[PDB]
């Protein structure tokens, strides 16, 4: 059963969680090719692993910048989790290491680019196109949540398309192993659950709200709560009001009403029956969950590829030297990395 599968995956996860891999490569073992994106305290690059010729995505984080932004513990969470997980829609760490200046995490490369890019260009996805992606997220969150992990940054920017048109849930910067409630204000304004905004302790139910936002945005082409400034967005999210496009199916609207539910006693994914309330909803009635997990379903969209290491599905970012100081920075802070 699913329960069985998950139990065993947890045994696998806990062993790596309790004894994390460390220092499993070195920078000189990789050829850096192109920046695939940026964040506040680093960048992700396409790299080639020279001894194998494999391409990977290499996340390069500036330790001093991580410290300035108070993201030390969050970054230690990310690496510790990602080295421990294993799931068809995640990119676990193939290698990790650090030097005087930076932290490095090497992951499976997703050549199709961000879902965001394709969503914005095409405008909106059909309900079937949306459901295909949504299904993969439902399973991933089932997996993560069963490991007592909370993900906390679902959005199209953070869903990478692979060569077969399936997705990888990336950007584990805010992911945290927590059994009770937690309090950190983090995520992306459009995707924040009202509990987070209202400075309440919160739990994994915020990931199910975020799912509601994502399915809406995918199917509408814009999110349920938007404005020019965050503060106006926060006002809309808390208010208790959402409007659906007239082209939204009846089933879709009902699912979204149950995901975008301010009342935790009523929010799908948070009830007694957990994720099955989502899996067994009518909007998912055509979804064969095993076929999705097995990646046997035909993707409704598969990206264009010239070949290995092709990056045409990514935007261009300014390239900047990777400089390695002669002095070790922030040694104690990142001792366990």
């Amino acid at each position: 059963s699913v329960k069985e599968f998950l139990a065993k995956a947890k045994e696998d996860f806990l062993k790596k969680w309790e004894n994390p891999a460390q220092n499993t490569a070195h920078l000189d073992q990789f050829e850096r090719i192109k920046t695939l994106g940026t964040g506040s305290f680093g960048r992700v690059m396409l790299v080639k692993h020279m001894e194998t010729g494999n391409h990977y995505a290499m996340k390069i984080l500036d330790k001093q910048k991580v410290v300035k932004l108070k993201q030390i513990e969050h970054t230690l969470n990310e690496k510790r989790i990602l080295q421990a997980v294993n799931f068809p829609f995640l990119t676990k760490l193939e290698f990790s290491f650090k030097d005087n200046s930076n932290l490095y995490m090497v992951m499976e490369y997703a050549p199709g680019g961000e879902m965001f890019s394709h969503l914005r260009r095409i405008g909106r996805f059909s309900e079937p196109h949306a459901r295909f992606y949504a299904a993969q997220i439902v399973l991933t969150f089932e997996y993560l949540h069963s490991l007592d992990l909370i993900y906390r940054d679902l959005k199209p920017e953070n869903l990478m398309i692979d060569q077969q048109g399936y997705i990888k849930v990336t950007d584990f910067g805010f992911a945290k192993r927590v059994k009770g409630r937690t309090w950190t204000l983090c995520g992306t304004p459009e995707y924040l659950a009202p509990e987070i905004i209202l400075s309440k302790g919160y739990n994994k139910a915020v990931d199910w709200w975020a799912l509601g936002v994502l399915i809406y945005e995918m199917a509408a082409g814009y999110p349920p709560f938007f404005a020019d400034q965050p503060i106006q967005i926060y006002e809309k999210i808390v208010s208790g009001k959402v409007r659906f496009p007239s082209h939204f199916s009846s089933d879709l609207k009902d699912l979204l009403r149950n995901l975008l539910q301010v009342d935790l006693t009523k929010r799908f994914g948070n009830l007694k029956n957990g994720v099955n309330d989502i899996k067994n909803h009518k909007w998912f009635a055509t979804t064969d969950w095993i076929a999705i997990y097995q990646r046997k379903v035909e993707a409704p969209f598969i990206p264009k590829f010239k070949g290995p290491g092709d990056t045409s599905n990514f935007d261009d970012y300014e390239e900047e030297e990777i400089r390695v100081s002669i002095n070790e920075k922030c040694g104690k802070e990142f001792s366990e990395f």
């Binding site: 969050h74 920017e157 950190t184 983090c186 992306t188 304004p189 459009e190 814009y222």
Partner: peptide, 20 residues
């Protein structure tokens, strides 16, 4: 239209993560 209001907004590009 809501679409037009979105496209005319300042938040159609990549959205940054927030944290306290």
């Amino acid at each position: 239209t809501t679409y037009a209001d979105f496209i005319a907004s300042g938040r159609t590009g990549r959205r940054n993560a927030i944290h306290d």
